[PDB]
Amino acid sequence: WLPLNPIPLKDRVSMIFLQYGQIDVIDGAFVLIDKTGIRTHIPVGSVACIMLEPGTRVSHAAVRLAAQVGTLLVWVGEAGVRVYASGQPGGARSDKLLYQAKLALDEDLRLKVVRKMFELRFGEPAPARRSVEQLRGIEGSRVRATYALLAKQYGVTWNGRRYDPDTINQCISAATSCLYGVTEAAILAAGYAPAIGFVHTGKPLSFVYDIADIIKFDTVVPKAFEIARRNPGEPDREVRLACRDIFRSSKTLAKLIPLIEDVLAAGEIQPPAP
């Protein structure tokens, strides 16, 4: 017996959370094992991202198998954001990564890309003859205004974007954590590098933040506010389930790759074929 390949991200469930057990390989399958000896088969190849919560212990084999089927593993903390990840050793095509690099390296192409990013964000072309930093400024302003608007809309006390080494900020942060998950998954599936960004740069998930930022507020943040409305003991779960529901309902996984391609396309340079 020989072969094994990844399946398209399109066909997958967005993401699944595992907690308190060890994840092993049993007869070529990915399995969660409880303290009482409960096995639980997990269709790893049918998920874009697996989120490992505290108290989880991952076998070498499990990670190797998860990589072979092109599923991203992401270690997440006490209700926390993304802490770490493991995946496929790299982009499947040199051409794609190099394409991303050209676009990134020369400031004019970069300008074109960011402007498209802005357009996609707001439904409006960005003002003419403005540098990268200034567009950054407009973003920041507009974003603040948007948090204020959702707070207003949903009747939520909002005291700014604030972060913890407050309910509202945790809901937002967890939601974004999930979105950075899927966005990273897509970026890797597409064969590009998460570290090479256009707006954000110099950080390991720059491109992930760039892409996630585009669809963050039509998708994932509104419900963060709505859930924030409720004041429950354990927010996280409801947020997770709601994000699952939004990703399926709004076709997120399917759309993510096209969006990335169109974004990079705006460089007016030719993409390598799939």
């Binding site: 409960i38 096995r39 997990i42 699952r244």
Partner: peptide
């Protein structure tokens, strides 16, 4: 598992 329904194999 968070609204996903899977299967646990009892021992």
């Amino acid at each position: 598992l968070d609204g996903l329904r899977l299967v646990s194999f009892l021992p």
